[PDB]
Amino acid sequence: GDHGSPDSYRSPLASRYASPEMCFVFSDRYKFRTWRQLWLWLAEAEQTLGLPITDEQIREMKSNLENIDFKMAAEEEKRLRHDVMAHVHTFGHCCAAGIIHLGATSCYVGDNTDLIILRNALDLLLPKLARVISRLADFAKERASLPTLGFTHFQPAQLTTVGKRCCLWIQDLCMDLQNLKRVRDDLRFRGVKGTTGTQASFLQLFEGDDHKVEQLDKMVTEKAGFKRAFIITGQTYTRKVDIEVLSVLASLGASVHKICTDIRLLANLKEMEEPFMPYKRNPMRSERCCSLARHLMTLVMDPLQTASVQWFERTLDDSANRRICLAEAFLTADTILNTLQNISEGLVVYPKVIERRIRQELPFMATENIIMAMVKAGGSRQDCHEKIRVLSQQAASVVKQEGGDNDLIERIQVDAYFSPIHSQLDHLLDPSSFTGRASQQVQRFLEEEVYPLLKPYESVKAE
Amino acid sequence: GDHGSPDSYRSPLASRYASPEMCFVFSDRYKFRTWRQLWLWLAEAEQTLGLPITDEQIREMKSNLENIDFKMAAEEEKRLRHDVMAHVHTFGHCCPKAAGIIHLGATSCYVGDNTDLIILRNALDLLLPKLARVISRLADFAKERASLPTLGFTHFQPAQLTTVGKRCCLWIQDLCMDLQNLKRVRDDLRFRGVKGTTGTQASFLQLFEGDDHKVEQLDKMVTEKAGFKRAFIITGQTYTRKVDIEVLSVLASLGASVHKICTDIRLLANLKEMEEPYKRNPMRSERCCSLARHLMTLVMDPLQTASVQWFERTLDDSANRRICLAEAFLTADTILNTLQNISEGLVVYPKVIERRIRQELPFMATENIIMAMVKAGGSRQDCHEKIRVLSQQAASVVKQEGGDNDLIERIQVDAYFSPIHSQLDHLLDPSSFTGRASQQVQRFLEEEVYPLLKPY
Amino acid sequence: GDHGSPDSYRSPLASRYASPEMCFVFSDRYKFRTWRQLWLWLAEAEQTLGLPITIREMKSNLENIDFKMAAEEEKRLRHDVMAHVHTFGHCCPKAAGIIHLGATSCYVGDNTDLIILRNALDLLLPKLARVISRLADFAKERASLPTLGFTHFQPAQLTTVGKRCCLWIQDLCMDLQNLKRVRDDLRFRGVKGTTGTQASFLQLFEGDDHKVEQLDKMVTEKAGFKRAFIITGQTYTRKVDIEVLSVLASLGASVHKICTDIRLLANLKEMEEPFPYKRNPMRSERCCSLARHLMTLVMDPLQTASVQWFERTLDDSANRRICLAEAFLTADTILNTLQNISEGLVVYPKVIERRIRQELPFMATENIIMAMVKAGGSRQDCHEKIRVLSQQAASVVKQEGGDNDLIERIQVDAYFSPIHSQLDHLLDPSSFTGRASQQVQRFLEEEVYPLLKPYE
Amino acid sequence: GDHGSPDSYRSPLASRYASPEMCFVFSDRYKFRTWRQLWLWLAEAEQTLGLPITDEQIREMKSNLENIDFKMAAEEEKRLRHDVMAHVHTFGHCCPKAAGIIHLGATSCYVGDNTDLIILRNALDLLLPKLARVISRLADFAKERASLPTLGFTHFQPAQLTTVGKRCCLWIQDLCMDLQNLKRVRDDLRFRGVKGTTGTQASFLQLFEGDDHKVEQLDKMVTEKAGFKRAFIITGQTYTRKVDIEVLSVLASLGASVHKICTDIRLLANLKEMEEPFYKRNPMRSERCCSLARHLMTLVMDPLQTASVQWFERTLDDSANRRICLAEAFLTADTILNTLQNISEGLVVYPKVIERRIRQELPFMATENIIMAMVGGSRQDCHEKIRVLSQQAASVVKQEGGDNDLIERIQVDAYFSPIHSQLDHLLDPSSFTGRASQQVQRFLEEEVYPLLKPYES
Numbered sequence A: 001g002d003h004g005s006p007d008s009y010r011s012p013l014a015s016r017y018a019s020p021e022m023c024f025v026f027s028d029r030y031k032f033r034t035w036r037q038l039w040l041w042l043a044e045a046e047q048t049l050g051l052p053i054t055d056e057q058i059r060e061m062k063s064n065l066e067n068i069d070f071k072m073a074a075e076e077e078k079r080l081r082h083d084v085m086a087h088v089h090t091f092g093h094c095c096a097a098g099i100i101h102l103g104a105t106s107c108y109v110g111d112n113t114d115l116i117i118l119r120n121a122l123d124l125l126l127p128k129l130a131r132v133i134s135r136l137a138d139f140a141k142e143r144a145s146l147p148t149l150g151f152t153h154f155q156p157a158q159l160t161t162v163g164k165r166c167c168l169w170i171q172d173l174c175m176d177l178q179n180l181k182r183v184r185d186d187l188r189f190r191g192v193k194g195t196t197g198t199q200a201s202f203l204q205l206f207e208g209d210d211h212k213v214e215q216l217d218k219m220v221t222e223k224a225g226f227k228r229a230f231i232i233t234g235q236t237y238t239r240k241v242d243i244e245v246l247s248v249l250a251s252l253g254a255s256v257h258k259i260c261t262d263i264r265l266l267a268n269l270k271e272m273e274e275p276f277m278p279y280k281r282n283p284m285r286s287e288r289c290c291s292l293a294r295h296l297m298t299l300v301m302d303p304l305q306t307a308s309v310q311w312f313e314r315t316l317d318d319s320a321n322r323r324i325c326l327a328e329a330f331l332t333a334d335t336i337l338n339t340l341q342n343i344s345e346g347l348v349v350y351p352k353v354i355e356r357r358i359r360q361e362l363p364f365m366a367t368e369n370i371i372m373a374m375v376k377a378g379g380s381r382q383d384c385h386e387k388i389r390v391l392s393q394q395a396a397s398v399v400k401q402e403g404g405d406n407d408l409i410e411r412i413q414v415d416a417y418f419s420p421i422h423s424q425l426d427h428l429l430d431p432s433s434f435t436g437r438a439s440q441q442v443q444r445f446l447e448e449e450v451y452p453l454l455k456p457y458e459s460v461k462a463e
Numbered sequence B: 001g002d003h004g005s006p007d008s009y010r011s012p013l014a015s016r017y018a019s020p021e022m023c024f025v026f027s028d029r030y031k032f033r034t035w036r037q038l039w040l041w042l043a044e045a046e047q048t049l050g051l052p053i054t055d056e057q058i059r060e061m062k063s064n065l066e067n068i069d070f071k072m073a074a075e076e077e078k079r080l081r082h083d084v085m086a087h088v089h090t091f092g093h094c095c096p097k098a099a100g101i102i103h104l105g106a107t108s109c110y111v112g113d114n115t116d117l118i119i120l121r122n123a124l125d126l127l128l129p130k131l132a133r134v135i136s137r138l139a140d141f142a143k144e145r146a147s148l149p150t151l152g153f154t155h156f157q158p159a160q161l162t163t164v165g166k167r168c169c170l171w172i173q174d175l176c177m178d179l180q181n182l183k184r185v186r187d188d189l190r191f192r193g194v195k196g197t198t199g200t201q202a203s204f205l206q207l208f209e210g211d212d213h214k215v216e217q218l219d220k221m222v223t224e225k226a227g228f229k230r231a232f233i234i235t236g237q238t239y240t241r242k243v244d245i246e247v248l249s250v251l252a253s254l255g256a257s258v259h260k261i262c263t264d265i266r267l268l269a270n271l272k273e274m275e276e277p278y279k280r281n282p283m284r285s286e287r288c289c290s291l292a293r294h295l296m297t298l299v300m301d302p303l304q305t306a307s308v309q310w311f312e313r314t315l316d317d318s319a320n321r322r323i324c325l326a327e328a329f330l331t332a333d334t335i336l337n338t339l340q341n342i343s344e345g346l347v348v349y350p351k352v353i354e355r356r357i358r359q360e361l362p363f364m365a366t367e368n369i370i371m372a373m374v375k376a377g378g379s380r381q382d383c384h385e386k387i388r389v390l391s392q393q394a395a396s397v398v399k400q401e402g403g404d405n406d407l408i409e410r411i412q413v414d415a416y417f418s419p420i421h422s423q424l425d426h427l428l429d430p431s432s433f434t435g436r437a438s439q440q441v442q443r444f445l446e447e448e449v450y451p452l453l454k455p456y
Numbered sequence C: 001g002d003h004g005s006p007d008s009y010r011s012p013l014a015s016r017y018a019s020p021e022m023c024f025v026f027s028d029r030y031k032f033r034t035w036r037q038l039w040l041w042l043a044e045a046e047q048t049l050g051l052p053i054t055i056r057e058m059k060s061n062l063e064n065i066d067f068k069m070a071a072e073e074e075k076r077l078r079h080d081v082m083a084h085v086h087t088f089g090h091c092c093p094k095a096a097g098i099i100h101l102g103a104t105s106c107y108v109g110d111n112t113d114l115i116i117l118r119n120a121l122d123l124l125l126p127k128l129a130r131v132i133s134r135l136a137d138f139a140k141e142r143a144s145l146p147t148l149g150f151t152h153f154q155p156a157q158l159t160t161v162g163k164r165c166c167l168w169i170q171d172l173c174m175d176l177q178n179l180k181r182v183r184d185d186l187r188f189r190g191v192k193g194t195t196g197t198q199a200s201f202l203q204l205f206e207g208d209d210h211k212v213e214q215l216d217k218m219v220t221e222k223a224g225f226k227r228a229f230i231i232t233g234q235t236y237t238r239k240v241d242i243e244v245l246s247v248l249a250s251l252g253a254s255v256h257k258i259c260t261d262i263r264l265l266a267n268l269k270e271m272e273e274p275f276p277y278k279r280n281p282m283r284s285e286r287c288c289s290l291a292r293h294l295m296t297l298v299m300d301p302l303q304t305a306s307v308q309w310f311e312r313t314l315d316d317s318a319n320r321r322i323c324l325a326e327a328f329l330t331a332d333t334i335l336n337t338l339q340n341i342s343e344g345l346v347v348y349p350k351v352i353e354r355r356i357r358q359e360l361p362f363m364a365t366e367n368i369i370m371a372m373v374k375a376g377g378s379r380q381d382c383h384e385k386i387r388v389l390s391q392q393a394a395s396v397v398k399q400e401g402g403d404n405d406l407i408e409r410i411q412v413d414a415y416f417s418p419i420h421s422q423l424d425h426l427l428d429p430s431s432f433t434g435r436a437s438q439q440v441q442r443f444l445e446e447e448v449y450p451l452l453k454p455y456e
Numbered sequence D: 001g002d003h004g005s006p007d008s009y010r011s012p013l014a015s016r017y018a019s020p021e022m023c024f025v026f027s028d029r030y031k032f033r034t035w036r037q038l039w040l041w042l043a044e045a046e047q048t049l050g051l052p053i054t055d056e057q058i059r060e061m062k063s064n065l066e067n068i069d070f071k072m073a074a075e076e077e078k079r080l081r082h083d084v085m086a087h088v089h090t091f092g093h094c095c096p097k098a099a100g101i102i103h104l105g106a107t108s109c110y111v112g113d114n115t116d117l118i119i120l121r122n123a124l125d126l127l128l129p130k131l132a133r134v135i136s137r138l139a140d141f142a143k144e145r146a147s148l149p150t151l152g153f154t155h156f157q158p159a160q161l162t163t164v165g166k167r168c169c170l171w172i173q174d175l176c177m178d179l180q181n182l183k184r185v186r187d188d189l190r191f192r193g194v195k196g197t198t199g200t201q202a203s204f205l206q207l208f209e210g211d212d213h214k215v216e217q218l219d220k221m222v223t224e225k226a227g228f229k230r231a232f233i234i235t236g237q238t239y240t241r242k243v244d245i246e247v248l249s250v251l252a253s254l255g256a257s258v259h260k261i262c263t264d265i266r267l268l269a270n271l272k273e274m275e276e277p278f279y280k281r282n283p284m285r286s287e288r289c290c291s292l293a294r295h296l297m298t299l300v301m302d303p304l305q306t307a308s309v310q311w312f313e314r315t316l317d318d319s320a321n322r323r324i325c326l327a328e329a330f331l332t333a334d335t336i337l338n339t340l341q342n343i344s345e346g347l348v349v350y351p352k353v354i355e356r357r358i359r360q361e362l363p364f365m366a367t368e369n370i371i372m373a374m375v376g377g378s379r380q381d382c383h384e385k386i387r388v389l390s391q392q393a394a395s396v397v398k399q400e401g402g403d404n405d406l407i408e409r410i411q412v413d414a415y416f417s418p419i420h421s422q423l424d425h426l427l428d429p430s431s432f433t434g435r436a437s438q439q440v441q442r443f444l445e446e447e448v449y450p451l452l453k454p455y456e457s
């Protein structure tokens, strides 16, 4: 087992889905290395502020951040039924021992690690989402002027373009990118707060010096790479934070489910397919994204409920739930972005299928323009409307009652009434003349909104 | 290793929480051995109904149900991008004589769906006795404490006395509703059987040269081999994903029951009236609420999934079900194992309970005091007013001074209540305020609980 | 006015969606009438058990509800049940003293909610049965009409229009069984006192437990319920609300799936909702919209039950006013709308036929190979030859936007001369539907009609 | 009547809970007045950009924005089975000159969607001041009570003392995050504008005879008339239903905050340490807040599911759901904030009840400082001797239902002779509250007051 024995349950998010990078962020090695990192930082800062901590103690700790004895820690945890003290012991064993965790409570490691993990998990998602957006934007640009049947109520509607529709998709994902970046940036550090949030043990440690306590809190926050620490906590950071993070993943799920549902419907229509020659192909990656996106939406109710029933300075009914929902929300989001990147790399378009479908539907939407051209030729709008209405009903009935191709244009051609227009008919039915401002909209959107958001991710010159 | 390297995420449900039995039911070994079992049962039934399958082919399959080369299946899935096809191939590799007849006529869901149904039913069967055992233990506690008065709480404020056992029956009753729900869903679970790519059995009909009777026989025979009483007549490719709603909905409701019970226990621990088996934290109860919450959340997965299945099925159910079905059962198992341990060891502190009743009961006793004063030949009008002023004073000592409730002491030295003084002991006997609590416990256990547990 | 002024928010469920019958079940008039009806049943039973009571000015004033007075009382007391005892007592001067004799507020509040829930289920059941019956008529009508099967919303082994309708019918039949079980299993709260201990009643009957049990039996029987709880706190267990809204949520999932399928078939022009060029399946869209809210709402009672403390907390009350009515008014609307969709549902066989003509040839190549082998050809060779023609046809379709000409390519090819005479029969769509039509028949005879018989 | 007759279901959110102002924002009068406002603005802008619309047509529409014939609209809707077309016809009745130009070029969503956006923003602007007031009132209380020791609770068991004001800061902090969220969502809300049937503006482009600049300017002009800084460039028929998730998710999070705060107050009410403003009193307002906050949380699943299954340029399966969830979420949030303002206005505290509970629990928390004070004694010996006294004190409390007599046991014991002199001082409750008071002062100065300064009036 690197994901373990097949003789016991193994989470598919670990064993089947998420990237090894995100799997590692939520691994026990990452967690426990981070606990040691935090104890190292507490030591460093406690020394600076005058506590009795030698340079030598700080070096032996720094030298053993990664040398974690998991068999030992498991045995100690089993005996003490307390994970942090088990790790204090184990870290002391290879180390500095008497001053590890000096003055701190358990959440100094547990809760601050959770915050580092959440932020690092966001930092993994962000470039992946930007890559998907960038890949879709290339597609939108390429296909900006390609007419395609519009759909409202999934019924034929005013033509759009393949690239304009792709912009609906991109825009939602751009809102996600802004949301994730905001949440990542605004995440605050718990810091040093004590059992109930009052910093009592640290205040005793610093012999009543409130300013040394405030300095320590700022120092560990800065070492952890956070710009801001909470002033106010109970035992832990407010679980409202977990709602904020999972809500943004839930809304990302909704965007992806919509996008991948559209692609599935386009695949049925044979207009677009997932990246690669068999005649029948199933949109399995999009089906998978929808399946996983749904679980992201579902999971938002976990942190909403948890926060709602936290009592006072903390109840421990948050712990098991968070171990599952935070890790699994991010493993799920990771998988979805990885798959969606793959989807976005070489979407297959069939312009001749799209054209055929337009040829079958457009004439029903062209009748106003035909009416205008007759009236421009000095015809009667009224008479023309009545006549064209009857031809259209007849064409529609051939389609449904006979299962034939649409013959409206043929009907108009052999009708002498429309003789003043027969020479304009090809021009009047040119699909590019029905797509409104779709291509211009693509260009403006990409220039004004999409590329500026992508500029921090970019990662040839005139000479 | 067994649970994997510490360099990946490892589910807490596997490594921390659930029993080995439930973890085994949701293991890849059990899943794939069951795929092979289903292929064996298909071959046996098909041979019986006249298809060209040999005893040697059958013996080969039977001999290799557990002999699963997980490495080969992983490689072949990477190549084929199809999990069932990968396992058909892998099973044909260790069963070369049988290779050509494995999966004959079937679509992938034949093994996938039917195995999930077998797993769901077996998971229900592990839960049901554990739930019965929790109910039995709480029933014993309820009988033992049926007559033990305790302060009633409405709005979490002092109310008409109950008994420790009577309150316990609130917990038990919800859990009995859960036992009944789980049993009904278990007994009512139908097998998908043999249905074909779109549910029409077209492949099987062709194999049997248009003999509809043989197709129906095949469906009956695999169903019976699988230990199910009934198969669907109607399916698309999959069994209706409405089934997953039915199963996870009863688990969600069980989560709500547990969350409430364990909330009350956590409050009782604050009150120092009851504890789980000087600072002592109700951590098992906290863990149960925490996991019960997840059980409730998960119900939204199958509701959504079934709502957007298109036609004879879409594959957007598959990843989701891999996550939620196992998680729901592992979560439920864990709660019931933990609740078993809580139920085994509940400690009651009667002296604390009695102290609290003595602090609160005098304020609820004023009516009784009036009636005795009245029957002694006193003014219902005047006795109310006299007692009300003493009560206002006593209430101020409690809230304004943080003092003990001295309402009875007040009445004892007030001569207007002379007719009543001899009776005060008896007028404030907490046993006389519990209404029918203890009788309710006895009737409930005899009429409702014991009969439900008799089968376990 | 009847739905109020347009200058405030008015629920669309009342003003736009639900039937007047369902609206009236969740009306204040129905609610407060039932309060008085309960008060009459309480006084009647109390008299039969010998309390001091002679009932007719109560039975007189069941409908004579002075809403103006009651609102003034409630402002004054900030307690709805208190307000209506005073009001009913105002118009009932002869009985004011004996109204609510012994009871806590939940005697009217909670039992009325159970009466309302059961009456609401009783409005839904016939509606659901009727929809099922209409869909069954349609399934039988179209049992043999071949239609393109769909998995992943890609072409798959043919089904029939009627067989696909059976997928929809089955999910609804499960809903009908669920709704009937919950209706039949609903227990009355009866007479239970403030914390569930019947202390006030025990007192009233001077310690006679038997009479308290009898009273409880009597009011339950008067309310038309078979069974009361033995065990309650102040209220019936809010687990009941989970059981009810969960079955509604599952109904929403069924309906959302069915109406999604209809919307897809509407895009394909194979089906249309009953009678401009553009035809939109707006009733099916509305059903999906509302079904979605029905699934959403299950999280309300789940959360509520999970955080009820001890013998009850009042944080259930506002929530239940919203979610219970809304769930039933939503479900009423969906059933009404779905009935309307079923009535005149339009099928276009020639559209269905044309699409099968475009897709079936790609699924027919195995049968053509078999016919050629039978004519003494190589399986392998024939496969290669038909593969090249199939790729040509697929390119016409996807690369050129043409009609599928595979059958024509085979017809004009001399290699396939041994089966040219058989092609028309080899491509007969009815020969590709497997057991679809027989399954419709078996399902309707064994499962649907027996289920509907009781609703005849 | 005003909320309708008692013979039908009447939403309790209208009839029983929400403020009349929020009820008005989600009323039909407001909705259909706003549809008319949007039609007028469209006509003004189109006229300016050169379409054949006259001043008297504009004046006619302007004169009739409130003159809504609801009976006629209902009859038209029963006839047309379409709400926007019914209202176009009905407006055209009271505006006969303008009738032919009402809705020119627009699709139905031009009024429906833009009105919803105006409504969401106006609803957000009604909540924000209410939330600010709650925060202010709690901040006042937190400052007053900043140094009042009270038992800390983890796992709802005795823990290191906090203060009444510090604990209040937990509540205030969550609500400040809500205030920031609501403001953000409000400020970032974009207008749908003029987009056409599938969002391509084809109809407008043709009206302007192919002049893209005119189409772009029309969209800008209506957006500016509606008081929005920014319009979408990209839409289908509708604004993206992701917007509805963004708004209801912030409301759901506020529900979570409120549920937690009011759960704490209900627990304090049990302990008799704090009560809601004016012997047995029930925290019924806090209970109702929890009840409604729960519904606000539940509602988040509606928009999530809706957005997830919107096909292409839109499907109509959003419409009925949005009629219910958007109004209800806001009417629920309104009610909660109205009630919470009342709860926050005069919280009752009982210091002597608080003090007694601290006296019962603090000895068990003070044992470390006793050992420190003894340690010129022995850390090992003092710890073993103090342990047995704590076992004796704990069994009195639990097994015998008595008062905590640990301090007495120490006082009588000759061993602790050298510490008896300082025992009162060692058990001073203010010495156990850590930095609670200072944390409150810094929080209020740094984080809360600056957030509230924009709401001074």
Ligand SMILES: Nc1ncnc2c1ncn2[C@@H]1O[C@H](COP(=O)(O)O)[C@@H](O)[C@H]1O
Pocket (backbone or CB within 6 Å): A081, A082, A083, A106, A107, A110, A316, A319, A320, A323, B016, B287, D154
């Ligand atoms: N106040 C606390 N803060 C942090 N961890 C705790 C606290 N109390 C107990 N624990 C430990 O945290 C872990 C919780 O386990 P679980 O419920 O499985 O997440 C166990 O090791 C507990 O012993």
Ligand SMILES: Nc1ncnc2c1ncn2[C@@H]1O[C@H](COP(=O)(O)O)[C@@H](O)[C@H]1O
Pocket (backbone or CB within 6 Å): A284, A288, B081, B082, B083, B084, B108, B109, B112, B315, B318, B319, B322, C151
């Ligand atoms: N119609 C089908 N029935 C069963 N399994 C399928 C079907 N189509 C594809 N699969 C396979 O099902 C698995 C789905 O993977 P996941 O989405 O990760 O659960 C993949 O290996 C697919 O190739």
Ligand SMILES: Nc1ncnc2c1ncn2[C@@H]1O[C@H](COP(=O)(O)O)[C@@H](O)[C@H]1O
Pocket (backbone or CB within 6 Å): B154, C078, C079, C080, C081, C105, C106, C109, C234, C314, C317, C318, C321, D284, D288
């Ligand atoms: N124990 C109780 N049983 C029944 N109703 C109560 C109880 N306590 C208060 N009430 C009333 O129940 C109603 C709750 O209103 P709401 O929270 O708006 O549903 C109010 O009129 C309360 O005064």
Ligand SMILES: Nc1ncnc2c1ncn2[C@@H]1O[C@H](COP(=O)(O)O)[C@@H](O)[C@H]1O
Pocket (backbone or CB within 6 Å): A152, C016, C282, C286, D081, D082, D083, D084, D108, D109, D112, D316, D319, D320, D321, D323
């Ligand atoms: N494409 C559309 N855009 C806006 N409204 C529409 C559209 N199609 C239909 N409607 C109308 O929108 C309303 C939807 O009503 P409901 O489904 O009850 O919310 C009905 O009056 C419909 O006729």
Ligand SMILES: [Cl-]
Pocket (backbone or CB within 6 Å): A103, A104, A105, A106, A107, A108, A191, A192, A193, A194, A195
């Ligand atoms: Cl700390």
Ligand SMILES: [Cl-]
Pocket (backbone or CB within 6 Å): B105, B106, B107, B109, B110, B193, B194, B195, B196, B197
């Ligand atoms: Cl099968």
Ligand SMILES: [Cl-]
Pocket (backbone or CB within 6 Å): C102, C103, C104, C105, C106, C107, C190, C191, C192, C193, C194
């Ligand atoms: Cl009662």
Ligand SMILES: [Cl-]
Pocket (backbone or CB within 6 Å): D105, D106, D107, D109, D110, D193, D194, D195, D196, D197
């Ligand atoms: Cl528009």
